[PDB]
Amino acid sequence: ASETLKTKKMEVQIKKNFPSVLQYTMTDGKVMYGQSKDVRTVEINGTNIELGDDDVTFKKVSDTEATYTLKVKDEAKKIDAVITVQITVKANQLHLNVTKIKNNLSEGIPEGNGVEENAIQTLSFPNQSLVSVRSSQENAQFTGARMSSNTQKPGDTNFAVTEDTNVTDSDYTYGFISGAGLSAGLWSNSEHDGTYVAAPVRGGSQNTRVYATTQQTGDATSLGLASAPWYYHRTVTDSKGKKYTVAETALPQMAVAIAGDENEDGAVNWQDGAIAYRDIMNNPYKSEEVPELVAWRIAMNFGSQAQNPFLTTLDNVKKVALNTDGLGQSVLLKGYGNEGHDSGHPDYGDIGQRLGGADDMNTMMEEGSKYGARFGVHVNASEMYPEAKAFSEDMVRRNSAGGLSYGWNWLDQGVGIDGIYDLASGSRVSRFADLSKEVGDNMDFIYLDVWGNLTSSGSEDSWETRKMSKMINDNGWRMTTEWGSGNEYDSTFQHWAADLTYGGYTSKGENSEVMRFLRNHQKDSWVGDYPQYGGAANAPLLGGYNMKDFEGWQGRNDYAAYIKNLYTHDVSTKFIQHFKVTRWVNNPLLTADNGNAAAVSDPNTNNGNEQITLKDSNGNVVVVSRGSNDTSSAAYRQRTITFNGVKVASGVVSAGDGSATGDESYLLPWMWDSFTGKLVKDSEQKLYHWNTKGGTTTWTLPDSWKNLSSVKVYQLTDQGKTNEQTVAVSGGKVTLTADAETPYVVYKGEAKQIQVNWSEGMHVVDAGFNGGSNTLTDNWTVSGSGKAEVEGDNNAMLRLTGKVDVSQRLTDLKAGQKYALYVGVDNRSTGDASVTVTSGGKVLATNSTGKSIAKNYIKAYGHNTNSNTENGSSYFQNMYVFFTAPENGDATVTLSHKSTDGAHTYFDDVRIVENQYSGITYEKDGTLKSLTNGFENNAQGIWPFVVSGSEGVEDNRIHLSELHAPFTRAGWDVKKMDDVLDGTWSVKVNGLTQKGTLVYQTIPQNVKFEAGAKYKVSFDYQSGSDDIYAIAVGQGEYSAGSVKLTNLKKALGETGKAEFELTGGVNGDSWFGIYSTATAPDLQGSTGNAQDFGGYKDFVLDNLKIERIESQTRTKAEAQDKVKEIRGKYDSKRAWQQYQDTLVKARVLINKNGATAEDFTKAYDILVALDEYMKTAP
């Protein structure tokens, strides 16, 4: 016997003896079958149990709901369960939910996720056939999807269901059946992993949730769909062999939705079922905001450098907002935590103190949201460093031998995290809670790096990935991840899908027509244009996110290229995501040969060439059409886009792989706000215009613009809307002239400038010189005979020439508190460039640099030596002052150039930060008396040192190491060096042996050594081997063979001491530093990772002390005699520039009117140093 459940759209006949459907009858009389045969199988823990009449009780709750109680028992196999099942119907949907599972053999999971004996681990209903179609029905067919990251291998299958179709639990991510005028897909929350087409990783790539099985049904073959098995209480083992039972992510759920000809195209196939399927499918959390995310990019910090503090990222948000006229953004903070990128894993709650900590991060996010910018952070749940407070013996993944599972060595040695322990112990969820306490509700997303690559365990399956995504989504965070194929269920972005350059054609986003038809609008997880990959990547009609960056990720810093790329691919891609696919025909990727014979070829659509139709909930219609399906035709890459029948884009996109400029032009109506994406005031609707080659094009305006007599057009730049033009509208059409690759925005009437207050929270207005030439009148005050300009078409800078002062009042200081102020400076002049903080005309603090001597090698930094500040190079380095905020609240910063030279000084990034450093002591006249540094208060970087060129422009393997005993100390595992010598922080060099060049160095702007003055330098150190690192002393820009070197002896696990004296060079440009020799390390018979983790190749420095010392006082005569002695030694040589230079300068000190004993002593000491130099001169 049976009962009927009923909605306005259908009646469903259900069996009383099992949660089975006999058939669905739609209002119009069309019928779809369920399970026409007596099948009553329940699987628990892999055992099939067939239920009899007495094993099932039934109750019809209402016309929309029935409840079943299933006794599921097999004594032999230790199964004794009672399963409650609910069937409900609404509209054209039927839901089947397991609402209760009672285990008669268990009291549940023991405390701390102990093993539950006889746990019900898996449950399914084999061959349940919730919906079915038959070989006897008209146009009976199946379409299924599996995961493919390979642009040349489609994930889909499309075939007719015939009497020969034979299939048993054939598994698919998605599965649709159609026949006799109806179509249905089956949805399930099953975490089952199964068959895939192509995927480089696990991590949820393999989730297959639908099982297709044929059975004989009278004289016909019936293809039925069932859910793949669900996990309930799964028992798992960690890397140490410890077992746990972990409760279900969610109770079992599944559903079907019955469609007729939903897109009204006269055929019934999976596309009709897919439209209905959107009403029942899981939707990734916060997938509704994806179409607003026009401007993705990464802002990077690394190696303690603070390349991108949070308030700077906010300013770059405002710059992008101006240049895009306020389109939404999604900024991925790679290195938001601890010392930067790939430091501090997995302490999710440790927000980078050198970046401004949680406070600046929150200010950035809160203010950024007003410009439609979302923020998210890069985390790692697979690898960790000793420095992280979460690092523990239980967190460590061990191999079967009991040794560490080592990760990557770079700044420090990474160690695998035991992924099963991290889940089952509650450790990972607790660290995400730490992060939640810091960010509250402000942060948009998590970016989970690497998950799926088997670094945390050999599984990382869909079950683990589902739990991972849930702990993230539970904190209000949208899920995003690295690998193109990963996390089909929950992820809304894959870095290796959106950045098309990575991985190659086998390793991209999801190459499936079914998946993209269903979810294009919900994810940036697809294949975009990158034609060298072929197939899916040759001009996809839907486009696809193409991600570039300008804030340091992999050295990327080209802002203009970033913006051009947004307009080339991303604006149209995002426009398209505002609509949902309703029809897709003539797909050239699908053939009879690749398992897709039943895909539609409609010769009456677009000449039988590919076309996709999309609609929104207001009935707007977008149609995207391929010029030709033949890849050797010029027309294969031609795309037309229409909006409500009107052409809004036409042509060939510049190749997404950078290889060939295109000719596409567009006039796209951007009808939505950058927030929840609602329609904007009819009066603030706008169109974006782009013309790849440049030139003149004519367009039909949207219907609501058709009666206007003119429009207003603005050219968009980094300053916002410029060059307003009034363009006549004639018969609803406009003609537009555009420079090539230049963005314009079109309004119905006059439009106001997006308001921007540069550098909120930064104590100064426009700290990064983003406000155009106007900033030097509106924000900064310029004075003097020289010249101040905002210079650079990329990351703009202050450029000074001649005698000029540029100043600005400081705001929002806490009176009586200590601050560092540092500014990037590159001085090409021989004259000094200075930074000064004054209060009431009185100097609080001041510092200066002569000609810069050290090029910038910091890859993630915006003015490194690959960025061309001037000539082939950049010498940008941070120049500091330290002051106490005055009680009267009156403080001013001045940036200046003194000399009347024609050469330039560059400044950028004025940073005022609370800072407790107080290790500099001056002499009466303001020269250096002493500088000490335990590195406990570094605002950023390895100050007073700067990183040198031993790795070129790199994410340099030098940073501030952090204490976390015992793991960071000698003696843990195979570690033989302490990371930290004193306090919590030291300067660490990792593995930079045999470079035969300078590793880092002081510079004059950081530590100035006065000409002829004498200084004692000392520090504590550890060094992994004898003579692998040396003290270097030099004057001016480093050059091979013009430095004094002193080899350092091994101090491995016990701290050594170094001290030496130096005499200031005559040009004030002396410096000392650490140098990597040509000597090989002694690895003490260590092999494998031990060679790196042992510390044999490393150098740690702490407790630096620099102090002026008393020199033996000299008379003028002694100095004069020393000149004679030196000239007697070397004037007869010549077998010399340095010599003559030092000599002239020494004689100046000697002969000056009013010279004193200090002058004579300096002259004498200068000549003694000249003597030592000259002994080993070229």
Ligand SMILES: [Mn+2]
């Ligand atoms: Mn249809």
Ligand SMILES: [Mn+2]
């Ligand atoms: Mn700048």
Ligand SMILES: [Mn+2]
């Ligand atoms: Mn220290």
Ligand SMILES: [Mn+2]
């Ligand atoms: Mn470290």
